[PDB]
Amino acid sequence: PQEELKLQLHMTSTISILYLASTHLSLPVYTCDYIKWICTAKMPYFQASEILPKSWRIQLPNYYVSILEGSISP
DNA sequence: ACTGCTTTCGCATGAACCTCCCAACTACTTTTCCTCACACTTGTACTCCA
Numbered sequence: 001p002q003e004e005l006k007l008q009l010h011m012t013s014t015i016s017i018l019y020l021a022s023t024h025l026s027l028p029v030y031t032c033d034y035i036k037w038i039c040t041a042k043m044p045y046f047q048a049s050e051i052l053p054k055s056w057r058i059q060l061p062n063y064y065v066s067i068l069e070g071s072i073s074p
Numbered sequence: 075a076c077t078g079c080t081t082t083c084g085c086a087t088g089a090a091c092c093t094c095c096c097a098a099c100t101a102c103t104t105t106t107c108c109t110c111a112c113a114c115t116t117g118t119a120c121t122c123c124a
Contacts, residue, residue, distance in 0.1 A: 010108055063107055 010067060011045060012074050039073055046070030 015034055022029050038045035044052065049060075049069035057065070 006107085008108075012108085061105070063105055067107060
């Protein structure tokens, strides 16, 4: 319900839904072949809030823009 | 009586204040997000004691 929805999205989600598309396609890429392509600054997991939108940034509140960049690693 | 004691007055034109706020960079909060390992049971393992 839109009344107090509290949607559960994190940067751990956008890798997890990117891992499941790899096993339905039956790919040899894994979470060792994801954490080696994100912590080596290859696909934009880290620092995503700050450089990606460039026009949609400013009206987003402070705790929401905190979650969308690559804050920690999982 | 007479002084001091006033009072108008001027060659013609050109022109020649102060407190509070918005500063600047510090620091110490806000605005709700995500991420989970913790309490008592219960079921299942391999002992038991009569």
